[PDB]
Amino acid sequence: SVLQSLFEHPLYRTVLPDLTEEDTLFSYPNWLRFHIGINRYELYSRHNPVIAALLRDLLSQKISSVGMKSGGTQLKLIMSFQNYGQALFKPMKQTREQETPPDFFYFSDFERHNAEIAAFHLDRILDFRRVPPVAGRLVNMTREIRDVTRDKKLWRTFFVSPANNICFYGECSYYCSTEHALCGKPDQIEGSLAAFLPDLALAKRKTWRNPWRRSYHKRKKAEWEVDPDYCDEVKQTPPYDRGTRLLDIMDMTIFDFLMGNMDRHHYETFEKFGNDTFIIHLDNGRGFGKHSHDEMSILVPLTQCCRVKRSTYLRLQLLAKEEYKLSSLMEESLLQDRLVPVLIKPHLEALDRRLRLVLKVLSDCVEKDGFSAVVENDLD
Amino acid sequence: SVLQSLFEHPLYRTVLPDLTEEDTLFNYPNWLRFHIGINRYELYSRHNPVIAALLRDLLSQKISSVGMKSGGTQLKLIMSFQNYGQALFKPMKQTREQETPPDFFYFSDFERHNAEIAAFHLDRILDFRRVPPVAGRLVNMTREIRDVTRDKKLWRTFFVSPANNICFYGECSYYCSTEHALCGKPDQIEGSLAAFLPDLALAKRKTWRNPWRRSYHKRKKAEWEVDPDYCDEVKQTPPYDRGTRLLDIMDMTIFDFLMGNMDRHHYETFEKFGNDTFIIHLDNGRGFGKHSHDEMSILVPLTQCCRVKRSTYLRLQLLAKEEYKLSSLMEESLLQDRLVPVLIKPHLEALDRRLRLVLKVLSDCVEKDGFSAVVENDLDGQP
């Protein structure tokens, strides 16, 4: 298919260096084989049928217990399975065709499973391998959420609406009230199960602030919103001139621009590797809210810093030729998810148009700083 | 009349649900009509003109016999009247101009009759209606304490001071000595007659520990004093996730901060109603000691729990509007006591300033958990 052509092309057969005694973080159950496959450079690599098989486990392994991470932005549940592996559950807050209204600020946006699903597949198509796997799933919220929690703060919020439907809302801060409830028809809600990274006890994770963090207030603009030479100073700030880091943040901001996800207020790393490893692309629920509007604000880090990874630049050039192209390559996968169609056609169609903006931001920028200054080189 | 405007506002016309055969504790003298008026949700209601007339009894009823509560923290007397009803008497231990010393711990604080009275009016202005009625009264301590007691331990402590005044101190532990005696000029002492709750023979009261109870010694910090997420756990502990209970402690913990009463080590319930009734706001004598100082420790239950009642939030916002305001609304009623002024004016000024801290603590706290999580709604279906 279109997806068969991509993973045979040599740009997706790039192999990583050999792993040392470090670089490891650490026929078992699938959630555990996923943890040990995590190394310094990626989160799973192209092969590894565990990732595909962990997606079947997230879909259909029996939910044994459900708990609620209290005091979050919106509702996120923790599902615990029969085989001791757990997962993060984000439920459906909006339909597929809906867009965030234009008068909403970026911090008033909902977290939607459509982005959670599409972000793992979008990330896997860019051969980043940084998003933990996510599967879509229909959950009988009587048999699989309400009746299998001993967390009465979540059980207490279940009621029956005048429509004889089962509803619930939990306890967060944004949109956890009766008027923002989640209601099945009559008792299934649908949502995204994101596989859980290893417990923080046996795998510490440093939490970083990213330098283009927006001003989570109205009227007050952020530092980069006023200073056009902001990137001349950021290439001389502590940890960001040592990697594989400026190179890795430009990777992520192209990831985010493709989805329109402007909520990248922090990014997490795996500690055991230091300032020179990959960035975990977590909590991607804010993307794919607008498909007829391209948010250039997210891209400003690319027009200001003007440099990409060569691995990721050459792949992007490939994903624009029609014989491969994101849209058909994106709808090709995401067809192996249960919540199909996880992206309505305008979101898949906007992925192509947003892609060619990244390629033009590089071409206008490659003819003002020259090659090599713009394009690194990891093809050796 | 600013007090007239308040009781016309719809926030003071809220009606309760219907009272069943339970919810009454029971199934004439003025003190007895107060007992039978106790129901599940309140202690008297705004209607009940008995309360106003019961305060007249505490002012002018003949004191027939006086006895001393053995083993109290400080001096506390029991007055029994001609009509067999009784009342609790706290004598004047501190003047109107005094403040508690800054180096005093909450457990070294004096209990003063001004607090007993002012807490009753402050509670009535907040439409809580949880404090038993209390009236101030001047007592001829010759004719009304010494010469009408059969308690040798209270009688033995009466003496005449070198200033030819009559003094006495009783037998407690804090401030029951000659050097802390209570002296009229020359034989009137003044104090607060707090009407008596029904006898415990026919009305059991369950006694609860409040979870923000301080560690009543120096050096030792309390449970909540180290853990800012203390109340995330208290809303998951038996009786505090079922009410109308976490919310009822928020009512009380806002009351205490307004008065500065940090000695709320326990609170009482009526049992005959179960875990689903109101909290009797008792023993408020430790409040109104400081008027140039705002004690934030008392408010910690609210900043940690971050949830209040909407009835009680809107009234708090209302009691800050200049056309209502604690100040004028408090000195209005408190002028109906014999001991006018029961509160010195900077204390009424401090009541206003302390209120705006509570309203800002809810505003700063409502913008981090949001409405619906912070403000529960009990005016659903009310004017």
Most A CBs within 10 A among B372, B374, B376, B380, hence the mutation to make, goes to B372
3-class secondary structure per residue, A145-179: CHHHCCCHHHHCCCEECCCCCEEECCCCCCCCCHH
With beta carbons less than 8 A apart as the criterion, state whether B153 and B171 touch: yes
Question: In angstroms, how far is CA A376 from the centroid of its own chain?
Answer: 25
Q: Do the beta carbons of residue B124 and residue B333 sit within 8 Å?
A: yes
Q: Omega into A91 within 30° of 0, i.e. cis?
A: no
- Taking the alpha carbons of B247, B252, B258, B263 in that order, is the dihedral positive or negative? negative
Could you say which of B232, B241, B370 has the minimum Cβ distance to residue A174? B370
**Chain-chain contact of A173 with B236 (C-beta, under 8 angstroms):** no
Contact A71 B369 (CB under 8 A): yes
Chain A hits for B241, Cβ within 8 Å: 152-153
Q: Which residues in chain B have Cβ-Cβ distances shorter than 8 Å to A172?
A: 373
CA B100/CA B367 separation, integer angstroms: 36
The chain B residue lying nearest A170, using CA atoms, is B373
Q: Report the distance separating Cα A172 and Cα B372, nearest Å.
A: 10
Method of determination is X-ray
Q: Does the N-terminal peptide bond of residue A244 adopt cis geometry, omega within 30 degrees of 0?
A: yes
Q: What is the resolution of this structure in A?
A: 3.5
The answer to whether the beta carbons of residues B135 and B88 sit under 8 Å apart is no
* Under 8 Å between Cβ of B170 and B153: yes
Residues of B in contact with A70 (CB under 8 A): 232
Chain B: nearest CA to A295, how far in angstroms?
A: 28
Pairing mode, if any, of strands B63-68 and A63-68? unpaired
Residues of B noted as catalytic: 263
Residue identified by tokens 């009410």 is B243
Q: Give the active site residue among A57, A109, A123, A263.
A: A263
Copy the structure tokens of residue B323: 């056309």
**Which of the residues A73, A107, A150, A173 would you substitute to probe the B interface, choosing the one with the greatest number of B C-beta atoms within 10 Å?**
A173
Q: What is the token pair recorded at B92?
A: 């004047």
SS3 label, residue B58: helix
Residues of A in Cβ contact (< 8 Å) with B232: 70-71
Q: At B159, which helix (H) or strand (E)?
A: strand B159-160
Helices B113-125, B246-259: inter-axial angle, 10-degree rounding: 130
List residues of chain A with CB under 8 Å from any CB of chain B. Answer: 70-71, 152-153, 171-174, 176-178
Return the SS3 of A7: helix
Contacts of B372 in chain A (CB under 8 A): 176-178
| A152, A153, A173: residue with CB nearest B370 | A173
Give the gap in angstroms from C-alpha B14 to the nearest C-alpha of chain A. Answer: 24
User: Which residues sit opposite B314 in a β-bridge?
Assistant: none
Q: Looking at residue A21, what DSSP letter applies?
A: S
Distances (CA, A) of A176 to A93, A170, A374: 11, 6, 46
Which of B231, B369, B371 should be substituted to probe chain A, the one whose Cβ sees the most A Cβ atoms within 10 Å? Answer: B369
Quote the strand ranges of A277-365, DSSP E.
none
**CB of A90 within 8 A of CB of A116?**
yes
**Cβ atoms of residues A135 and A158 within 8 Å:** no
